[PDB]
Symmetry: D2
């Protein structure tokens, strides 16, 4: 009859708002179309999203996902055209020096892969920006990366000059958005590459602090912890823009949504001693077992006190995580600059 199970209860407008929020979630490998395109490879099957080429390697403990989104796939799934490399150590912990060491290697290799077509010379001027608010622990990735980057420049062949770096902080206090601020600098610096380091938001809490995502599509709008970034890309600016991000937070309503769906999934997987067996669990757990993640999120948006959307979720030791990742990202960028741009 109706097309969506929530119709009659969740406003159609709120459902559409949530569909959009989820298409613009920071991890491309969390788009629904990308998770279907991975399952679909059972010796290759149709692929209803055609504008998605997905490579999948693995090198030690690092699982690599290379995704190219062409112009057709971008209109389909709502994410800028370009390349997305996601590196993931699922077992990673703060103490896991080896995993961090392996991620460092994979990061340097992916940095030249994604930048080979730029044809970078030992005469290129490279601008590194760490976005984030330093006093919000999981958002401090960017700024702490810039601090460590500046430190490592001393002990390194790389002269200052030909690599310039800034951590803009909360640029809104001065009357500019992070977009204009990075533009105001890139105009005078005239860089050949702009690398932006930022903290990202995941939907599944098990993703947090265990992945890097490198993309040549820049900083997408509505991204980051504050859900408030402006586009910073080769299109907005005229300079190639690479974003390196690590997922540090879940939005409070999104964490609720995945918990509810985890109840449904776990109960479903234990039938017969990750799909939801709606027919079996619906008499117990209700019609919303049939709903999609966005319908549940639209429900939460309507029903929860509004302060819920001002809340984030992060690990209790996310300050150790920030330190480990800020050191990983700065090191891979600098070793990449040494090996394959300046030496």
């Amino acid at each position: 009859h109706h097309h969506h199970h929530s119709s009659g209860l969740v406003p159609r407008g709120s459902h559409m708002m949530s569909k959009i929020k989820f298409m613009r979630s920071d991890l491309i490998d969390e788009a629904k179309e990308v998770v279907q395109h991975r399952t679909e490879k059972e010796k290759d099957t149709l692929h209803e999203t055609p504008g998605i080429k997905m490579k999948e390697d693995r090198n030690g403990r690092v699982h690599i996902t290379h995704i190219d989104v062409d112009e057709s796939g971008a209109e389909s799934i709502g994410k800028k055209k370009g390349t997305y490399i996601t590196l993931t150590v699922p077992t990673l912990t703060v103490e896991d020096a080896q995993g961090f060491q392996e991620l460092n290697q994979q990061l340097i290799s992916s940095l030249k892969d994604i930048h080979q077509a730029l044809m970078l010379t030992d005469q290129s001027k490279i601008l590194v920006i760490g976005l984030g608010n330093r006093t919000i622990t999981p958002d401090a990735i960017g700024p702490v990366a810039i601090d460590r980057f500046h430190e490592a420049i001393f002990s390194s062949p790389i002269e200052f000059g030909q690599v310039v770096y800034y951590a803009p902080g909360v640029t809104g206090q001065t009357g500019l958005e992070t977009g204009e601020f990075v533009r105001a600098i890139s105009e005078r610096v005239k860089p050949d590459l702009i690398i932006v380091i930022d903290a990202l938001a995941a939907r599944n809490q098990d993703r947090l602090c265990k992945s890097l995502q490198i993309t040549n599509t820049g900083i997408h709008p509505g991204s980051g912890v504050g859900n408030s970034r402006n586009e910073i890309s080769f299109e907005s600016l005229g300079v190639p823009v690479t974003a390196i991000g690590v997922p540090m937070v879940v939005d409070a309503p999104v964490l609720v949504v995945e918990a509810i769906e985890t109840v449904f999934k776990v109960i479903s997987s234990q039938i017969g001693e990750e799909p939801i067996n709606v027919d079996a669990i619906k008499p117990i757990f209700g019609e919303w077992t049939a709903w999609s993640s966005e319908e549940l999120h639209a429900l939460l948006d309507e029903v929860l006190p509004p302060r819920h959307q001002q809340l984030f979720v992060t690990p209790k030791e996310s300050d150790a995580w920030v330190i480990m990742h800020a050191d990983l990202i700065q090191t891979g960028i600098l070793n990449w600059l040494q090996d394959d741009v300046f030496g």
Copy 2:
């Protein structure tokens, strides 16, 4: 331990005692006395726990003043000031049983990890406290203070640490500032909890504070706490309950029969049953997640200023000066 809160006004017994009471009855049950009060925009909650209360509810015996401005925001200048006067007032009352003079020694302690935003209440308060004292011509040499941070890295528990200082400074009062975990998100950063019960075991963001009490080191220990986080599974349970209550009321006290076919049988369950199922099926890592306002760095500043100002106004007006 389900639905863990550090606020005393959030334990089930105290929420029922509060509705037996305002339903102009008297019939309590635990053996705990609780007077309410409002002073302008501040809702004061005086709560007293005898030893009968203590073992019933699982909270130490003593006194619990809870101030709250429900519409408080960071820009709320007026809200923050009445909060401060009420804090000084509560501070003399809870300590008038103590008869402190200009010759008694007050040790102020800020607990918390500075690099975890909502946990910074403690150390940022000591910072601002320090600033105020040396901004004041008053020596305040009868006021010492410290923020020990993560004492674990030195191989000492926060209890031992505070005792090693208190053993040597030999104080007559110990005021501890610290951030609390709460159970309802809308309580976050809008209440202070003053109590002569000190710091209860397993309180805080990390759910792991050691007891710092009268009973733990032999000095009076008064805690000033701000609820700054909710634990992630606790938040999920409250949110699911809020879906139920909101949808039920919008239909026409939860109406389980009307919402059960959409939202399922657990619409009838208790908070503890919901929390037990989530504890069984969610990945363990949820236990390691906390939930906090995106503006929590601003909240830390505002509350660190409030608490330092209260302690110092109270010290110079009613214990020195």
Copy 3:
């Protein structure tokens, strides 16, 4: 450039004009007008430089109010408050020629490197400024502010940087907070210098500030400076001169003939001659050393609070509100 100071009341011409004047004469020389005044414990020094003054002394043409509490310490509550009212007052006067309304845009800029203690005046002031604004219910959306730190790391000079913001925010006033180098150590942290000449080239701890002026970006630029350091060779010269003056006076205006056999012929030299010999013989690294009070972190806090409070009291009383 010998005996470099950033305070205008420390240039030789202004020290002679000040003794021609108080010796109840009039006969100046440069073409600069200088009224003195004291308001309680604050010594105010209004100084005006026309273009004749500008090229004589090597300081930009404009107005220079210099407030000073010679007995100021960090604990000096009263000293710090009169300082603040006098700062607001000086801020309306220096800006009453500007006719700013509730619709004009004020950009406040804190210069300095946060990790160099005495250079932190600027950024710590912006921090505290930010706190005060969002503590105030007033939006202050006509007040924007930034602390750019060490803009050099991004490949931009501080001048360009401030212009890239000012170009886009298009302000009507720019107030810059910054730490100054002085020439007499006993001036350190006891004066504010307000001036519509902005930030002179080569001022600051690093002796390397770019000009930020009316003439550099076309907006009014008012500097609020605190003298926080002395350059090391400058300090040596002043100290040697102090030996001479103290020993000479203790004998019975320096008495060169009496002290020359103990302290040598350079007892008769000028400050510039002494500084030239030191510049020739000392290792170059002296040029890279600064001198600052051991308590300078406390001073940064106190003055950052003062300056933020002045700017904001003045903005809401005399430009908004």
Copy 4:
């Protein structure tokens, strides 16, 4: 006639006060007796300070000075009995990654040399303390070292536990001296070694940030930037105490004193186209050309405004220095712990 040239002008008391201040200067290689004992080796000459054995090596750009002070020499020169290793790269700059790399090697080697006689096992509990006030740039050595030490523990075999570490900060705000505070912890931790990292004061400004001094005599009283340390040593505490210090400041009156003496020395060395030729320069420069550094300092103490003694002198980029040295000291300690105590 009289024994001291300043007699009649400088009070005898102030001269004695300054003699003491200079015997208790942080760098043992700046004691007057130690500089004479080095010159004296012209194929060995008498040595009027007999309680001083001085080794002198050099390994790459690192100049090493090993000094042992026996009980006789300690009464003579006023510095605790024990060993002092001073490593120095005179050419060192913040950017000098190689010099820092060489200093790191020398530091690890000296750390086991000075600790061999302790017979440390993989079961020893080691306590590292970084003293200093973090908001006074050159004094931030200690605390920043502890931050970096804590970070490197994650990425390193060394479990936390068996190496505990604290940065006490300004312990006077709580009613304890840094002495009692380190005692209050060492009693409960019961360490087998206590390593203290602190910033030191030099007399010659050319020393700043170019040396490390490792000693088993602990933290001497009156040391550090504040001239206010309490003894923290094997004697005060009962646990062996090693101090690692780097000189970051000159006291303002002491900098004046060396400037004045530099005038006298430079003028003196250019006669005939580091002694002071008193007879030649005294008609020009005065009787105080004959005075000793302490007599000049005693003069300054009497004559200068008292705020002069509340002033310190540090390089304009001493924050980069703190970062480079805090990373050097933490790295050498941790590599020493790995190679020669736990692996």
